[PDB]
Write a protein that binds this ligand. Sequence first.
Ligand SMILES: O=C1CCC(=O)N(O)C/C=C\CCNC(=O)CCC(=O)N(O)CCCCCNC(=O)CCC(=O)N(O)CCCCCN1
Ligand SMILES: [Fe+3]
Length: 276
Amino acid sequence: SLSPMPQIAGVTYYGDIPKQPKRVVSLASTYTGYLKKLDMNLVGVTSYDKKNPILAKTVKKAKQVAATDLEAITTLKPDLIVVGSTEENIKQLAEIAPVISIEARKRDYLQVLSDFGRIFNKEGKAKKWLKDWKTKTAAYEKEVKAVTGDKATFTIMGLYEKDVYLFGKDWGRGGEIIHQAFHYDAPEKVKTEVFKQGYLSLSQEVLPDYIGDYVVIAAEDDKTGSALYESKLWQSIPAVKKHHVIKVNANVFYFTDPLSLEYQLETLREAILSSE
Ligand SMILES: O=C1CCC(=O)N(O)C/C=C\CCNC(=O)CCC(=O)N(O)CCCCCNC(=O)CCC(=O)N(O)CCCCCN1
Ligand SMILES: [Fe+3]
């Protein structure tokens, strides 16, 4: 029995996708949690998946694999491999098992779930989650905007090693919830320089120019942000002086999947409400 394999923008099939795969290898942390949400049995997952404190609990049995670990992936005997479209070795992966390749941003973070529901005939489960999400986020939006005001601007940022990044509405780090689910505006330069591009690496000195009312900042640990937070440049930013900086744990906040997002939603709601 094969998947109906619908034509979906950004989804490429290699081989005959099983309708009911029993041994799924996920090589893209974007998708792992969607597969889990739809009760797919994962036997391989990524390093990020293992470090995500929400998701990791659900995939303890899975082996940590990278896309280059062809031998380990083969040994796992998958009947389905799920990958991002930018992976360079799709040919060799497809020799191991059927592959679903997904190109980020062709479908939104919600569509991806209903898309997998169609691929695997789990539409009911997908629809129910999406319904509750849309109802909950609509209510939560009203609550948070009652504190911030409706026109408050948010910037999504992330700290990685010595680097500083801004993110748009659809590159994780809380952007889906802040920009899409809560319909928060962003500063002008964020909308014109970051949103379409997905992300932007930036030098410290111009950071003030991209921050308005609030900032959500992702990092994997406390030490990464240390120097920045103590800098005069940083302390000069109005949002910082007003205590409108929401620091979040990247280990879960990198992610976009339903399981991660459930946790991120409560965290962001609570953080914004307590900013008052
Ligand atoms: O899908 C998302 C949000 C968007 C995202 O980050 N992606 O990687 C998916 C879309 C791009 C796939 C193509 N891969 C790359 O461009 C490699 C670099 C990359 O992953 N990026 O996100 C580019 C900007 C961040 C670079 C610094 N690295 C990290 O922050 C590690 C977390 C990091 O960026 N990762 O991707 C690892 C955890 C990802 C969890 C799921 N999150
Ligand atoms: Fe990434």
